[PDB]
Structure formats: structure tokens, C-alpha cells
Amino acid sequence: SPLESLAWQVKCLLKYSTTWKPLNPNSWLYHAKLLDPSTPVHILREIGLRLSHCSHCVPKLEPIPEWPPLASCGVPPFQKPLTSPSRLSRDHATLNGALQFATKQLSRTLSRATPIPECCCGWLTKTVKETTRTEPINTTYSYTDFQKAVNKLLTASL
Amino acid sequence: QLKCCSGILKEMFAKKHAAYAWPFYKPVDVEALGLHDYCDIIKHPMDMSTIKSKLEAREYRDAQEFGADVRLMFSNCYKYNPPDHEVVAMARKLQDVFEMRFAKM
Amino acid sequence: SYNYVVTAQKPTAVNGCVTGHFTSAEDLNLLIAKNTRLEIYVVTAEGLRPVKEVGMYGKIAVMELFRPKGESKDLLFILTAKYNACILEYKQSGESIDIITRAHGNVQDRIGRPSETGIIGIIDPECRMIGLRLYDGLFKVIPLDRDNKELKAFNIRLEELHVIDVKFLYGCQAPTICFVYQDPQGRHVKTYEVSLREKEFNKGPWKQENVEAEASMVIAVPEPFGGAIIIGQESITYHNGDKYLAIAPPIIKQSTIVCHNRVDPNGSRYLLGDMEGRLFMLLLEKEEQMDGTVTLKDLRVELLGETSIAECLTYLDNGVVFVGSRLGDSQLVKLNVDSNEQGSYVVAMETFTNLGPIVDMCVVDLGQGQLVTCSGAFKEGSLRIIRNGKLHIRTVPLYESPRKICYQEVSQCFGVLSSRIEVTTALRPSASTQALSSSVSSSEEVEVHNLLIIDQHTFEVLHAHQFLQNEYALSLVSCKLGKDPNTYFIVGTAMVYPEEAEPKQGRIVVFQYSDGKLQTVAEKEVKGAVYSMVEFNGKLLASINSTVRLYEWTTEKELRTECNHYNNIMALYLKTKGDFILVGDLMRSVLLLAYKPMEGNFEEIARDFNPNWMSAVEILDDDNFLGAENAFNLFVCQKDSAATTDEERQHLQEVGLFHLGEFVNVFCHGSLVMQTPTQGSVLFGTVNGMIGLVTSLSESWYNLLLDMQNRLNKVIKSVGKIEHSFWRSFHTERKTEPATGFIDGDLIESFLDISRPKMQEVVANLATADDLIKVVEELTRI
Amino acid sequence: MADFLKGLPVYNKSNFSRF
Ligand SMILES: *CCS(=O)(=O)Nc1ccc(C2=N[C@@H](CC(=O)OC(C)(C)C)c3nnc(C)n3-c3sc(C)c(C)c32)cc1
Ligand SMILES: [Zn+2]
């Protein structure tokens, strides 16, 4: 798909960036199956959410939690919970329906989790906009523009 | 004569080679590609678009001056980048066409 | 931002209860811990007499009575969730009641991983020390003496990192702990001795023994028996060294026992509450040997009957048992030797209202606002109608879990999402199974989800629609869509399978309830869980997994997709105002979207990029966005007005922070008072049944009330000597900052109750006291 | 009937008598 090709292109250039800060490959988001690393398009998603960012443009981004807190999933990082399933269900029964559903899903998915072993923003913006051969040289793009363009592309393509 | 030179340059712009020719189509922008070293390690910058503009300016005296600029482009790439790198291998690939069709000039 | 937060309804869920002699040597006292509240009752001929109710600047996690040698009456130990430890004494000097802070301190550690099973606080039977299990691998010992006024504790390294439950054993020459822990070899029970002078652990009286896989509770038995009773899932065991005595009664297999209480002072009888609400009595049979020693012969469990789902139990006196519930109403019950002819020996004496958990609520006008909340869970689940009087509450029991509520004024009915547990066969009759008219959707324990149409007047289940197998109903809205004059009940659902991480299926089902009948008007198949739905300018705004989709209602009475937004992890919450949409994420805090009518698509405005585990979101106004997260904190985000660059303009700035101490489940626009220093009114309902109100103040009002906060903090004495600034400080396991842009309305309101000399001291060199009394009264009337 | 509920502890027999 064209979106997959653009994602591949973006990944293959960011693999050279020393200022790029990708999301941790052992993030709970991969473990919870909320991001799919099988298909390259995940990078674009991570760009859209500022889960992967350029440190040159955004030097002071707040860190992304590695594992959800106990209230959020009821599962210690990559460990089976000590608390009995009945007790966890009773605790989750106190949550609003959307949060209850999310928490039960996260518990169920992160119970089976296993650990994963461990600035070109202007040109990436032009690549995502598909305007590498048309934009003037004077045009300058930061990570903000790259994020906006990635979000627009995902909206159009997903 | 330079009509032939233009024909090789168009055959390098041609869509068959663009899978490997695309980095050379325009000057290496330094603010966009984060390459805050080009101006120091490379002194005179050349690209296929500049070569095309110089053909349009008829600034070349002969096919060897065109050869000189297109060589200064490939040289600039072969130099600024580590060997085994991708742009050095799509460079090696693009020089191939240039030579195979220039050798027949 | 400038916000004012005030409690309208104090938390009602009971988190702890103890009995002892705290107010006097002769009084029999019941102490109840409801989150931030501590209530003291005297057991009398007429029942429970409340003598003092106190508020603490913390979330009570440990509450234990102990009597040191030389003390005429019991002292209290309280630990908060923010690790504020205090040894308190009840002091009475004639019509004046004071909770004296004998000792106070903070026992948090700079480094430490909080334990999964939570904070455990135990006291030595001889009151030699207080033990605290706070972190993995650390047992904190606070020596008890008159000179340790600062609670100078010391840590002992605990080899067992995964400790489930720990107690101090009786009849030991040295302070001894017995605890159940988990290792790769299963769950075991172990004992240690504590040496204060050596500051270390020594070998326990009896070596370790393997226990049940789900062994969860430790009960230290008094003399004459000694030893411990381990309670798990399908067995109850007794260990006292060479004495091992296990039983596996089938009656306890059906539900997990969650709480215990010792009835007899000698430990021959225990109360056990399970998750289904069943009350059992554990009986330990005595055997007086000819050697002169008393041993245990057999364990017996008898089904006493049914109570409210018990968080904690406590035998008071004369067969009366207090049952403290967080999932339902608490109750005083009576144990009788003779059954009620129904096989039940338990008879309920009194009910204490609990609103928790408030999973959803709404404000209706049945010009006076009333709150209707989905309270409780399982057999305790109900609807609660709260109105101003102080608060008057009517309970409509459902006997199943309510999940969502929406009012349909044109139909004079409420739509309520409900769930019941079936084994299919229902475990008990409930609202969904006893509807006047019922229908089923066309095209172990299981959750069966229903939409209940409930009369506004009689609060009777008029209709119940049973959704598909494996279908969970998440979102509900009552609205009119497009050009269709009919008002619909719209339900978002999700098919749930263990094979799937994210739901690959879900439905938007549009029903019409008319002429006392329910018909399915339309069904749309989506590719995920419909978490939230909002009526958006005649269109249907829904959140499906990680997407926010705006649908239009066509003339053919079917939903057609207008636009999509994909930049989310898990869009759980949606609120709208005008053309603005507040999208609450699972972890990515709040995002502001603007629908563009001229382009027919969404536009991202600004996202709060501080990771917040959102539980509820609300829009205060076009600029201010209020959110609550799972660490009991409220925040207010603004669009950066001083933003000069695009990057700055993409950021929502957290301008207000406040530690509430409550887990907010729902925000709603509305007031309980009849239709002022403050503008706006947002009610919030929380897990513990606490209901609060957030309003907005100007710069001058906020400044004045913050100065008053400082003066009151200087003047007002805190129970446990906890600083108000420390308590209200925004706090997660990652980040801690002082509260900003939030006025603690409870603190300000407390100014009216202090003595007039204290009032004059507070307002000195501010301004007479009368003007500020008028100010605080105006604040109260909101 | 329930011989195991016969002797429940009494701290003060007046307690809960006038409930
Ligand atoms: C990832 C796509 S790829 O086609 O597989 N490989 C690829 C193509 C072109 C380049 C370019 N490299 C730069 C020097 C460099 O390594 O730049 C960064 C990648 C930004 C670190 C280069 N040297 N000489 C020339 C003409 N280039 C250009 S111009 C241009 C546009 C690009 C992408 C390159 C790297 C990998
Ligand atoms: Zn950048």
C-alpha cells in the first residue's frame, strides 16, 4: 500500500538520525497490541501521538511510562499478579464502563506479555507530504510540521 | 553534441532509474536533511538539476565539462558518505548508466 | 486557571473498621475509616452513637488500635496513602473532644517499589513496635515508646519480595511476624522474629510450610491456640508449628472469602465474608489435653447467611455484627441461634447508605436539579436519586451492576445499561430478569448485558433488552439525530473474546422506546469497542477503539460516516462544547479537536502531552479542560495564550493541579441547588461515593481565598499534624508538585466553624470578620 | 438449632437491647 511504502521510507531515513528518540521497543503499547510493529505504519502512528520524536526539535518531552500503573491494568511489569482474579474483577467493577473495559482488556493482554530484547524533520515532512520534488529549498520544516503532515496522511489513508 | 548530453541526462531523469536516482535530482539541502557537515567536507556542490540548468544556460563548452560536473556530483557523494552506505550504492548504480551511455557518445 | 473544589457529599464507602476502647477505658468503640474520614461510635443500648467524626489530610490505609503498658485506654495508629503516620489519643475534658497527636511523622522512603497487595500496618500484641509492609523487600519497624515522638522508624531487609499478607502472632517471647509469600515454587507461609536492639530479623518459631495457590489471608489466633489460620480460595488451614489442620469445605468453593473478624477473645470463632455477600462462621474446636495444654482438634465452617458484600466485618456485642461495605450499603446485622425458617441465622438490623461506586451519573429536573447515579455493583447495584434538602437519597435496588444512565425526557424514562452474572442460569432474580417486557437481540461465569428502560416516576423496569452473547454495552446516549424527529436510545457495544486483544467487532444499535415498547431502529457494525458517544450538533460522535468517528443520520434511518480521527491510543472519553471536542485517552491525557463545518473533517488544536491515566474528562469552558486521573488528582489544562510558535500552540498547558484523594468516575454539568463569587458548576462522582463540585473564580477571588488558605493553615490544627499543602500536592509515583490554581473549598468552609478569636486572628491585617463570613457563606450556598 | 452461635461474646448485656 502507498501508506506502507511511505512508512518504510520514513523508517529507513530515521534509522540514521542520532537526534531521533523512538518509542521504547519494550513498551507496554506493543505488549498490549495497541501498536502493531509487524507493519511499518506503526512508526507514523507513533509520530502522530508524539511517542516517537526528534530531540533536536523537542528537547523536553515528558517521558512515556514503560508499564501501566497497578490501577490501570492490575499487572506488575511482566509478572503474574499476586492478587486473585476475583479480587481484580471486584476492583474493576468500581470503574466507569469505558475504563472498566479498557482495564480488563489491558489485564488480559498484559498478563501474557513477555519482554522484548533491547535532524531530518524537514525532509521527512516533504517525504510525507509527497512534495520532495516540488517544494522550494527555502521551505523549512520542524518536527511540528512533520507531526501535522503524518497526522494528515494517516487521516487520509487509514 | 550537447543534444546527446541532454539525452543522457533525461535518460537519468527517466522513471526507470528513479528507484535509485532520486537523491541526486536536487542539491543536498543541509537544513532539511540535518547534515550540518556538508559545507565543510564538500566545497563545490553539484546536482542533476544544476547540471540541467547549466545545459539550459549552454555553460558547458564540451561533453567533457558536462562529464566533469556529473563526476563532481558522484565524487561528492562517494566522498561525503561512508562506503557500504545506501547513497553510495545508488550512486555507484547511477554512475553505471552515465558511463554505459557516455561511453557511446 | 482558577478553580474552587468543594465536597457536596463526603465519601460513604467503608475502607476499614475496628473495635476497641478508644474514647474511654469503659466505652466500647467502633472506628470506621472511609477514605479521608474517621468516624468514632460508642456502642450503647440504642445502637451506635457517633461521638466525633474527623477529617484527615490523607487517605487512610492503616487504622489499628493498641494499648501500650501504662496507658489507661487504647491509642490509635493511622497511616495515610501518602505515608503520614500518626499515633493519636482521644482526649476529653468536658464537652470538649480533641484527637491528640501523640506522635506524628512521614515514613515514606526515597526509594522503594510499592507492594502489589498494598500497604499493610500491623501492631505487636504487646505493643512493642508497629510493623509496616510498604515496599517490596522492606519491613519498616516503628518502636513504641514515649520518647519516639517523631516515629523514627528503621527498615529491615525482607528477602521475600512478593509478600501477600502479614500479621504479628500471639504468645511469642519476641515480636514475631507470620506472612504468606509467593515465589517460583508457589505460595508459602513463613515466620520471623524481630529484634529491636539488634534491628534485625531472626528465625521464626516454626519453619515455613507450603500453602494454597490462592492463599490470600492470614489470621493470627490468640492464646490458648496461638498459630495462624491461612484462608485461600477453596481451603482453610491452621498452622501452629507441628500442628497442621486443613479443611476444604465445598460451601466456600463458590466465592472468595475477602474479610475476617475474630468474635471470641480466645479465637474459637471467626466471621468470614465472601464476595457474594455470604457470611460464614469459622469454628475452631478445642481439646483440653490431660497434660494441661489446649490444642486444636478440628475446623468447622457454617453458612450463617447473607449480608451486604463485605469489605470488612467487626463483631460489636450481643450477636451484633457491623458489615462495612464499599460495593454496597453498610449494615448492622444480628446473629440468631434460630434460623428465620429460610435457613438464615442472619437478620439485618440497620442500613448505612453508601453511594460507592458511582460509575456514572446524570443531572435531571424531575428548576431544581437532582443527581441520578449508577451506584454499587453485583447484587448491591442500584440507582441513587440525590437531591438537596442535608442531602436526601432514594435507593432503587437493581440487584445487578448498573453501568451507564441517560435521561430521555420526551419518553419520561431512564435508559440504564446493566450487567448481570450468569452461570446460562442467573444467580438471583434481578432488574433485567424481572422486567415487565423483555426482548433479546437478533443479529464459568458470563456477563449478560441489558438495556433497561425504567420509569421516571415509579423507577420500575418497564423494559429490558438482552444484548448478544459475549456483547458488552459501554456507551449510551439519548438524543435526536439529523432531521429525524424521534428521540433514540443509542448503545455502543463490543464483542469480547479471549482470543482478541482489542475488540475486532462492536455495534451501534439505535432503539426507539415508544408506546411502552422497544424496537431496534438500526444496527451498525463497527470494528472495535464503542467506548464513548456524544450527540454533536445533530450528529453522532463516537469513539471506537483508537478512532473518533462522526456519523450522520440519513433519511433512510441509518448511520453514515462523515469523518474520522485516528490520532489516539484508546479514545475512552468524549466531551463536546460547540464545535469543540475533548478526547480523553487511556494514557495520552486530553486532546482538543475542532470539527470544521466548512471542510467536513476534524482539526487537532492542542494536546496535553503529559501522560495522564485519565478516568474522567470535562470541558469547563472554551479555554479550560478539567481532567481526573487514577492517582486521585484533578488537573486543568489551557490553550497557551502566550504561545508565539506553532510548537507552543500544539500544547495544552496544565495550569491547575490538585490532589483530590478520590477516584473520579464521572463529570457532569449541573448543580444541586436552585437556579455569586464563582461561575459555572461541575459535579463529579467518585469510586468511594464522594460527590464534589468544581467552580471557577476570578483572579482577585482566587488570590483572596489562597491567602485565607495560608492563614487558616497557620491557624487550624490538623489531626496527625499533616500539612495541608503537602496533602493537596499533586502526587503520582513519577511526579510531585504543590497544588496550583485550585482552592480547597473544604478548608475555606471550615473557617466558619472556628472560634471568633481565631476568626479575628485569621482576618487580622488582611478587613473585618463579618465581610469574610459573608464571603464564605456565599461560597457555601453554591 | 445453631449450637455454634449459642455463646456469642457479651461485653455489656445492655448493648443493642434498646435498638
Ligand atoms: C531510506 C531511503 S533509501 O533510498 O533506502 N536510502 C538513502 C537515500 C538517500 C540518502 C541521502 N543521504 C545523504 C547523506 C545522508 O546519509 O543523509 C541522511 C540520510 C539525512 C543522514 C546524501 N549524500 N549525498 C546525497 C545526494 N545525499 C542525499 S540527498 C537526499 C534527499 C537524501 C535522502 C540523501 C540516504 C539514504
Ligand atoms: Zn527535528
Short mmCIF file of C-alpha atoms in Angstrom, two decimals, chain C residues 315-538:
data_model
loop_
_atom_site.label_atom_id
_atom_site.label_comp_id
_atom_site.label_asym_id
_atom_site.label_seq_id
_atom_site.Cartn_x
_atom_site.Cartn_y
_atom_site.Cartn_z
CA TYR C 315 -18.38 -8.13 65.86
CA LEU C 316 -19.57 -5.40 68.23
CA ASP C 317 -21.60 -7.03 71.03
CA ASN C 318 -24.52 -9.38 71.79
CA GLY C 319 -24.53 -11.07 68.39
CA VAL C 320 -24.45 -7.75 66.50
CA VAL C 321 -22.03 -7.51 63.57
CA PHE C 322 -21.11 -4.38 61.64
CA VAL C 323 -20.58 -5.05 57.93
CA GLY C 324 -18.61 -2.28 56.26
CA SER C 325 -19.19 -2.29 52.52
CA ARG C 326 -17.62 -0.33 49.68
CA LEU C 327 -19.61 -2.00 46.86
CA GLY C 328 -22.92 -1.52 48.69
CA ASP C 329 -24.60 -0.13 51.79
CA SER C 330 -23.01 -0.99 55.12
CA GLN C 331 -25.19 -2.70 57.69
CA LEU C 332 -25.64 -3.72 61.29
CA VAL C 333 -26.87 -7.32 61.33
CA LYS C 334 -27.91 -9.66 64.14
CA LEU C 335 -26.83 -13.27 64.55
CA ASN C 336 -29.52 -15.55 65.96
CA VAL C 337 -29.30 -19.09 67.32
CA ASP C 338 -32.53 -19.96 65.47
CA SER C 339 -32.97 -19.53 61.72
CA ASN C 340 -35.69 -17.44 60.06
CA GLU C 341 -37.33 -20.62 58.62
CA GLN C 342 -35.45 -19.71 55.39
CA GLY C 343 -32.25 -21.33 56.72
CA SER C 344 -30.71 -17.92 57.54
CA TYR C 345 -29.37 -17.09 61.01
CA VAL C 346 -28.52 -13.50 59.99
CA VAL C 347 -31.09 -10.73 60.35
CA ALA C 348 -30.35 -7.21 59.15
CA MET C 349 -30.81 -4.55 61.82
CA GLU C 350 -29.76 -1.27 60.17
CA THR C 351 -28.55 0.02 56.80
CA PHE C 352 -25.94 2.75 56.27
CA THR C 353 -26.12 4.42 52.88
CA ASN C 354 -23.13 4.03 50.58
CA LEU C 355 -23.13 5.71 47.16
CA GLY C 356 -19.98 3.90 46.00
CA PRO C 357 -19.01 3.09 43.48
CA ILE C 358 -20.51 5.93 41.44
CA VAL C 359 -19.73 4.56 37.98
CA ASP C 360 -21.97 7.07 36.17
CA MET C 361 -24.45 9.81 36.97
CA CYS C 362 -26.62 12.50 35.41
CA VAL C 363 -28.44 15.67 36.42
CA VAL C 364 -32.18 15.82 35.76
CA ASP C 365 -35.15 18.03 36.60
CA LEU C 366 -37.95 15.69 37.65
CA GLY C 367 -35.84 24.31 38.26
CA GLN C 368 -34.29 22.09 40.95
CA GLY C 369 -31.50 19.72 39.93
CA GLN C 370 -31.36 16.09 41.05
CA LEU C 371 -28.49 13.64 40.67
CA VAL C 372 -29.25 10.12 39.47
CA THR C 373 -26.28 7.81 39.94
CA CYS C 374 -25.49 4.25 38.97
CA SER C 375 -24.21 3.05 42.35
CA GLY C 376 -22.95 -0.25 43.70
CA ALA C 377 -22.13 -3.44 41.85
CA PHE C 378 -23.37 -7.02 41.54
CA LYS C 379 -26.32 -7.70 43.89
CA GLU C 380 -25.74 -4.28 45.52
CA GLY C 381 -26.03 -2.36 42.23
CA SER C 382 -28.73 0.25 42.30
CA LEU C 383 -29.83 3.72 41.24
CA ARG C 384 -29.50 6.59 43.70
CA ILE C 385 -31.59 9.77 43.50
CA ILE C 386 -29.85 12.58 45.39
CA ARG C 387 -31.45 15.97 45.96
CA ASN C 388 -30.73 18.99 48.13
CA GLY C 389 -32.81 19.36 51.29
CA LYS C 390 -28.91 17.84 54.08
CA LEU C 391 -28.78 15.59 51.01
CA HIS C 392 -31.80 13.32 50.57
CA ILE C 393 -31.12 9.98 48.88
CA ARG C 394 -33.62 7.49 47.48
CA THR C 395 -32.38 4.00 46.61
CA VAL C 396 -33.77 1.88 43.77
CA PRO C 397 -32.13 -1.55 44.04
CA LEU C 398 -31.42 -3.33 40.76
CA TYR C 399 -29.65 -6.45 42.15
CA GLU C 400 -27.26 -6.19 39.20
CA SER C 401 -24.50 -3.81 38.17
CA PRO C 402 -25.58 -0.51 36.55
CA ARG C 403 -23.01 0.91 34.16
CA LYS C 404 -24.50 3.88 32.28
CA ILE C 405 -27.53 6.12 32.66
CA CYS C 406 -29.16 8.63 30.32
CA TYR C 407 -32.41 10.54 30.75
CA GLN C 408 -34.99 10.63 27.94
CA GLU C 409 -37.36 13.46 28.86
CA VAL C 410 -39.71 13.00 25.88
CA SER C 411 -40.29 9.38 26.97
CA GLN C 412 -40.35 10.14 30.74
CA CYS C 413 -37.94 7.24 31.23
CA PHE C 414 -34.33 6.47 32.06
CA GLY C 415 -32.10 4.29 29.93
CA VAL C 416 -29.71 2.27 32.03
CA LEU C 417 -27.00 -0.11 30.90
CA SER C 418 -26.84 -3.09 33.24
CA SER C 419 -24.84 -6.28 33.61
CA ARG C 420 -25.68 -9.47 35.49
CA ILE C 421 -23.61 -12.59 36.15
CA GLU C 422 -25.00 -15.93 34.97
CA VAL C 423 -23.60 -19.43 35.40
CA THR C 424 -26.80 -19.96 31.29
CA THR C 425 -28.61 -19.54 34.61
CA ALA C 426 -28.86 -16.32 36.63
CA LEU C 427 -27.53 -16.47 40.20
CA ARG C 428 -30.50 -14.47 41.53
CA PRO C 429 -33.53 -12.52 40.23
CA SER C 430 -32.59 -9.01 39.16
CA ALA C 431 -33.97 -5.99 37.33
CA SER C 432 -33.07 -7.38 33.90
CA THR C 433 -34.74 -10.74 34.66
CA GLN C 434 -37.88 -9.18 36.21
CA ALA C 435 -38.77 -6.64 33.51
CA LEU C 436 -42.38 -6.03 32.52
CA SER C 437 -41.48 -6.66 28.86
CA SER C 438 -38.25 -8.27 27.68
CA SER C 439 -36.51 -8.87 24.36
CA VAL C 440 -33.30 -10.45 23.07
CA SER C 441 -31.05 -9.11 20.33
CA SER C 442 -31.12 -10.71 16.88
CA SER C 443 -28.01 -10.38 14.69
CA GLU C 444 -17.87 -20.45 34.36
CA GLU C 445 -19.47 -17.04 34.90
CA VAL C 446 -20.68 -14.91 31.98
CA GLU C 447 -21.68 -11.26 31.87
CA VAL C 448 -25.11 -10.67 30.34
CA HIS C 449 -25.67 -7.07 29.32
CA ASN C 450 -29.07 -5.42 29.15
CA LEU C 451 -30.57 -2.06 28.31
CA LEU C 452 -33.19 -1.21 30.93
CA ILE C 453 -35.97 1.24 30.23
CA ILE C 454 -37.01 2.42 33.68
CA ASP C 455 -40.00 4.59 34.58
CA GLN C 456 -39.03 8.10 35.71
CA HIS C 457 -41.81 8.19 38.35
CA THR C 458 -42.04 4.70 39.85
CA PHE C 459 -38.43 3.72 38.98
CA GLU C 460 -39.70 0.36 37.74
CA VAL C 461 -38.06 -1.59 34.93
CA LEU C 462 -40.52 -1.04 32.07
CA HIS C 463 -38.43 -2.94 29.53
CA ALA C 464 -35.21 -4.93 29.32
CA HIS C 465 -33.32 -5.71 26.11
CA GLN C 466 -30.78 -8.52 26.33
CA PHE C 467 -27.79 -7.95 24.05
CA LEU C 468 -26.00 -10.68 22.13
CA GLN C 469 -23.83 -13.35 23.74
CA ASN C 470 -20.35 -12.04 24.53
CA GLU C 471 -21.60 -8.47 23.89
CA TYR C 472 -20.70 -5.77 26.42
CA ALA C 473 -22.52 -2.43 26.35
CA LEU C 474 -20.17 0.51 27.02
CA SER C 475 -21.72 3.78 25.81
CA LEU C 476 -25.27 5.10 25.96
CA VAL C 477 -26.88 8.30 24.74
CA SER C 478 -30.43 9.58 24.36
CA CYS C 479 -30.69 12.10 21.53
CA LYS C 480 -32.32 13.23 18.30
CA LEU C 481 -30.17 12.87 15.18
CA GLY C 482 -30.28 14.76 11.88
CA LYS C 483 -33.76 15.55 10.55
CA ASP C 484 -35.43 12.62 12.33
CA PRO C 485 -37.88 13.94 14.95
CA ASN C 486 -37.73 10.73 17.02
CA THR C 487 -35.59 10.57 20.15
CA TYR C 488 -33.48 7.41 20.22
CA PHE C 489 -31.57 5.27 22.67
CA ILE C 490 -28.14 4.71 21.13
CA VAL C 491 -25.94 1.97 22.57
CA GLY C 492 -22.32 1.31 21.75
CA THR C 493 -21.19 -2.27 22.32
CA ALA C 494 -18.22 -4.59 21.93
CA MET C 495 -17.99 -8.30 21.20
CA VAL C 496 -15.48 -9.75 23.66
CA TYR C 497 -13.42 -12.88 23.08
CA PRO C 498 -10.34 -14.14 24.98
CA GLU C 499 -8.67 -14.73 21.59
CA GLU C 500 -8.55 -10.96 20.91
CA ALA C 501 -6.52 -8.13 22.43
CA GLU C 502 -8.56 -5.29 21.03
CA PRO C 503 -12.20 -5.97 20.08
CA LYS C 504 -12.42 -6.53 16.34
CA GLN C 505 -16.20 -6.05 16.44
CA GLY C 506 -18.74 -3.77 18.06
CA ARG C 507 -22.12 -2.25 17.26
CA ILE C 508 -24.05 0.98 17.39
CA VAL C 509 -27.66 -0.08 17.98
CA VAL C 510 -30.34 2.64 17.67
CA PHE C 511 -33.53 1.77 19.58
CA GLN C 512 -36.79 3.67 19.90
CA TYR C 513 -38.85 3.36 23.08
CA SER C 514 -42.38 4.45 22.19
CA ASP C 515 -45.86 3.32 23.29
CA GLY C 516 -44.18 1.32 26.06
CA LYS C 517 -42.30 -0.81 23.52
CA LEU C 518 -38.68 -1.14 22.42
CA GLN C 519 -37.78 -1.74 18.77
CA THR C 520 -34.38 -1.86 17.14
CA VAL C 521 -34.37 1.00 14.65
CA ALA C 522 -30.89 0.48 13.24
CA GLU C 523 -27.72 -1.55 13.69
CA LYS C 524 -24.25 -0.52 12.53
CA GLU C 525 -21.29 -2.89 12.67
CA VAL C 526 -18.01 -1.28 13.70
CA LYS C 527 -14.53 -2.73 14.11
CA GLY C 528 -13.97 -2.12 17.82
CA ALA C 529 -15.30 -1.15 21.23
CA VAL C 530 -17.57 1.89 21.28
CA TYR C 531 -16.16 3.49 24.42
CA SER C 532 -17.93 6.85 24.33
CA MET C 533 -20.69 8.53 22.35
CA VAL C 534 -21.83 12.15 22.33
CA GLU C 535 -24.58 13.89 20.37
CA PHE C 536 -22.65 16.50 18.37
CA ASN C 537 -24.79 19.18 16.69
CA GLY C 538 -27.37 16.71 15.39
#
